[PDB]
Amino acid sequence: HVGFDAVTGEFTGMPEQWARLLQTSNITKLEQKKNPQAVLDVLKFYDSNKMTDEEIMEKLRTIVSIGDPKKKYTRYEKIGQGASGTVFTATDVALGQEVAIRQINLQKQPKKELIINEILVMKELKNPNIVNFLDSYLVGDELFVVMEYLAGGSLTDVVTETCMDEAQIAAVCRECLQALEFLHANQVIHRNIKSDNVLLGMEGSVKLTDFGFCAQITPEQTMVGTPYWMAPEVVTRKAYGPKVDIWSLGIMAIEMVEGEPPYLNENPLRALYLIATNGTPELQNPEKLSPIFRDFLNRCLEMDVEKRGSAKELLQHPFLKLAKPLSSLTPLIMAAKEAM
């Protein structure tokens, strides 16, 4: 243990592991004397990046179908290789609908029984604003888990390739809040609200995705990238409630006027440092947008956790009543795709 620094001096009592992370970073020694505890919390954060065959079968007895996913599905394009599975995107050979396919090796899985029990829960959670469950298939030792997918891409390729005005953002943010309203009421914390994980349909539809399933279903729980979307309570390894998702939605709206999120420029350690120390990132260009929007941002991005809004309160915000109908998003999907 035994670690702090000298005031106007340097750290003493630190591992070589943490001192190397500190040196190879962009965190300048001014920024280390400025707030040495915030340094110590981000390093500690950065370092934290018996079921036999009859048991597995009887928990799977309600999700598995018979059928061959290699005949039933095509356009197999790899999309993800998260720590708890692989994620393909595929096309249903009948009916033409696009699908997500999660491939889980059961025999090699760390903590199989929870991975399975989470599937049993989203099987019982239907909402129009989340990707619903479709089917599972057992292939030898390799569970396949099929999910909804939507034709129009992510929010990201819209956000980075057109210009959304406030009433189109109001439509999208009101959709997400209905999802978090339902989700948080059934005791789930999403933990990963960002633009890559919002899926748009061609009709204008908004659905919310956790294909890595890094979602708190039971009490439990950064090579997941530069973590711009994380709330301040997350990164001090303070314990956290569902209010972190309200913060992460507020970072998504900044991405939706600036075109990009704050702190995506910089590497994850300095970026984690900045979330801890700056608090609210709101300052980028406040004159380009209305008073009625900025008050919505200042209830999403509160520092006091009780001062932050919950999803049900924020659904009655007057910025949300600006919302254009969802079909207004339709040409923006098209404009991204021909750019190619």
Place this chain on the structure above:
Amino acid sequence: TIHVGFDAVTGEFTGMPEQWARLLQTSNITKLEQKKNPQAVLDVLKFYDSNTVKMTDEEIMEKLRTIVSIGDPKKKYTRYEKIGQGASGTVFTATDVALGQEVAIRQINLQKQPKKELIINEILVMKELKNPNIVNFLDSYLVGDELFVVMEYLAGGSLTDVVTETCMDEAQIAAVCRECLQALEFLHANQVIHRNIKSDNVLLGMEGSVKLTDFGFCAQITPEQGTPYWMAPEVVTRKAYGPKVDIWSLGIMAIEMVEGEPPYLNENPLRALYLIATNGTPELQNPEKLSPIFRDFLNRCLEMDVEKRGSAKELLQHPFLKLAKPLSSLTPLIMAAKEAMK
């Protein structure tokens, strides 16, 4: 409030709120289990909404009279190492200047602490209940809005660090149960109910001493009033409870020690309260490997019946505790858990 009856036996629900039947569907609670135990299902639904569980500044300065010393805690102590922070308050290690001996410091707020008289009255009562098996109060300072509480420091971590290594055979378990019971005899002889006996409130030394804390400040001192594996069936069904809720919890803790994991671990929280209500005892994974005297010790702690459940005195005389190794035998376990903590 909205009301629910269950249409007598061999029968269903009506009056069921829209809110509850979603959380009961995604419980993985089968519609058959609901028919067998309708009352017990109704009770854990009511408990799950109550959750796990005004004052003038003149009144506060009355109660702080006997416990607050004057002095600057930032002069009296140094080398503050922040360990954790959050809801109960920021927890620290510090070194005494005068004594040269390490201490724990709980920096608690007072203006933003709801129901702050529950914690002030715990400190007042527990200040004078000194035991070798519970961790003793040392000092306190009022710094602005924050009351720094100085507590005795135990270097051997907690029992959770040991049990996540799982190397405890029945000799080493039985000594740790012996120390817990000695604390529980004291607490109940002085009208305290701990209510949260679990492996995070058992604090070890290097030489193997075992001591009890009440972090989070939840303990009955005057008769009134995560996923909770330690809770007895009478608490979880919103029935009435007495000092034998603690005896149930130490029974749950011997299973956590004998298996390396809390029971009900990666299962649903509301369905966990269903299984405590109706079955009560958690099923042991490999009962072949536990000696019958130990199994009889568990059947004596984890009785559903309260009067048949043994008291703090009675289980102290239970022969299972005579299998106990010296407390020095814990020292390799503690040192290995702290080394594997890297």
